[PDB]
Amino acid sequence: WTISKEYHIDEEVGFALPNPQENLPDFYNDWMFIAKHLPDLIESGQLRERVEKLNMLSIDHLTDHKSQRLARLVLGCITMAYVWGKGHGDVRKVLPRNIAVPYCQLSKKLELPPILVYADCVLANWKKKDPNKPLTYENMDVLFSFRDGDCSKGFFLVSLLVEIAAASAIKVIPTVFKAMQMQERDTLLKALLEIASCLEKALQVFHQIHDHVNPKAFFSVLRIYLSGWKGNPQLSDGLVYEGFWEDPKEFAGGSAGQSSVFQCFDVLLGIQQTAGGGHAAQFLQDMRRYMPPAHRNFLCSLESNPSVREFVLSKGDAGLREAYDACVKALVSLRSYHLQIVTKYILIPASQQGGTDLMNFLKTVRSTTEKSLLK
Ligand code: HEM
Numbered sequence: 001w002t003i004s005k006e007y008h009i010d011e012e013v014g015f016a017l018p019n020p021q022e023n024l025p026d027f028y029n030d031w032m033f034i035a036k037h038l039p040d041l042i043e044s045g046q047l048r049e050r051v052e053k054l055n056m057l058s059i060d061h062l063t064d065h066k067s068q069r070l071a072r073l074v075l076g077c078i079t080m081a082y083v084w085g086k087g088h089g090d091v092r093k094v095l096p097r098n099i100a101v102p103y104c105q106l107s108k109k110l111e112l113p114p115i116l117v118y119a120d121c122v123l124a125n126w127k128k129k130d131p132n133k134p135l136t137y138e139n140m141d142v143l144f145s146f147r148d149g150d151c152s153k154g155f156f157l158v159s160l161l162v163e164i165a166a167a168s169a170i171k172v173i174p175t176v177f178k179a180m181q182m183q184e185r186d187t188l189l190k191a192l193l194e195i196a197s198c199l200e201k202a203l204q205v206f207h208q209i210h211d212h213v214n215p216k217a218f219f220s221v222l223r224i225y226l227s228g229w230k231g232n233p234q235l236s237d238g239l240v241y242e243g244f245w246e247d248p249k250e251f252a253g254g255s256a257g258q259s260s261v262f263q264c265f266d267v268l269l270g271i272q273q274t275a276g277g278g279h280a281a282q283f284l285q286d287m288r289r290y291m292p293p294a295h296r297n298f299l300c301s302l303e304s305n306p307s308v309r310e311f312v313l314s315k316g317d318a319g320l321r322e323a324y325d326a327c328v329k330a331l332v333s334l335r336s337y338h339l340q341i342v343t344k345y346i347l348i349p350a351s352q353q354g355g356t357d358l359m360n361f362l363k364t365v366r367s368t369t370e371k372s373l374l375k
């Protein structure tokens with residue numbers, strides 16, 4: 001009773017793909033070579049030609065979901081490398097048909113947009129060095145990078161380690177809703193203290209970012225390859241997916257608003273982050289379309305259950321209010337620390353070279369979390 005079945009949420013890894021596939025069938029060896037040698041092919045300036053000189057491979061040889069997730073990540077990384085190139089200005093506004101058609105095919109099959117997404121580069125872009133050793137940074141590695149010294153391993157692994165840390169709270173969600181219907185007051189308080197404990201533990205995981213991500217490398221390099229073609233001046237009308245669409249289609253770039261973890265606690269605790277017409281709420285709602293289907297289904301199914309904030313508010317129980325508030329406080333702590341990280345990794349490098357609009361969105365989301373406190 002957690003239903004890792006219907007909503008595809010693993011007990012230890014959570015929204016992450018449990019044990020992602022490292023290699024694709026030999027049929028797709030031409031795809032795998034490009035994706036694995038992206039730093040070299042970009043630096044040498046022969047990535048684009050090597051992509052242009054590909055044959056349209058059929059997505060029919062991708063049998064299981066794991067291989068379909070790998071190919072999504074493989075083609076997603078190739079697309080970002082093709083579009084952005086060296087990342088200095090020369091942008092390709094047309095994705096070749098031999099890449100654009102199979103990518104769009106597999107994208108429709110997995111109900112995800114044809115752009116690199118959080119679920120590709122974080123949830124499915126990992127492996128454990130020794131399978132018998134635990135899930136720790138030191139025992140882990142990413143499958144794909146963009147450039148040498150892009151700090152993508154540190155960026156993707158720390159996001160994943162945070163996502164895994166938060167999974168420990170997702171398994172107590174059924175207990176929260178059942179304790180509410182059965183009116184098991186003490187169980188609900190204990191369940192809320194357990195969620196708060198897990199979110200407090202996930203804050204220490206964030207600390208690891210400083211050890212494996214450099215401000216200059218993230219801002220001047222990594223940031224470029226995660227950028228998309230929705231509201232982007234250097235791709236005004238979007239990107240053309242050759243032989244699939246007639247018109248250039250606009251797709252949003254990489255966003256952690258695509259992480260189901262933070263969105264599900266915002267829903268669970270009844271923090272009005274999606275409710276309203278404002279930019280912040282609209283953006284977070286849009287990013288749900290960039291999540292795997294089972295995961296966006298879990299978020300609306302949580303919305304379909306009675307409110308935890310309203311239940312706690314309906315009772316003159318200080319102990320239940322304190323437990324609920326510990327969860328909210330743990331979320332404000334994560335977002336307050338995250339705002340400090342964004343100052344180091346975006347605000348300062350930008351000053352030594354937009355960023356204010358990103359700061360406003362984050363401060364608003366944090367504000368909304370802060371205002372959800374009962375007191
Ligand atoms: C170098 C470190 C990091 C930087 C520079 C960074 C930057 C940003 C920026 C600029 C945003 C603005 C909105 C967007 O994504 O479109 C954002 C949002 C977000 N980031 Fe990070 N981030 C970092 C690390 C992390 C990590 C490790 C996580 C863990 C999962 C994370 C979780 C989030 C979440 C959940 C959001 C959505 C806003 C919210 O719900 O508060 N970020 N981040």
Ligand SMILES: O[C@H](C[C@H]1c2c(F)cccc2-c2cncn21)[C@H]1CC[C@H](O)CC1
Nearest residue numbers: 118121122159223226227253254255256
């Ligand atoms: O915030 C965006 C980046 C986004 C993101 C990925 F994309 C991939 C993996 C993890 C994360 C993450 C953590 N916290 C924010 N994120 C960033 C992308 C480039 C844009 O130009 C500016 C926003």
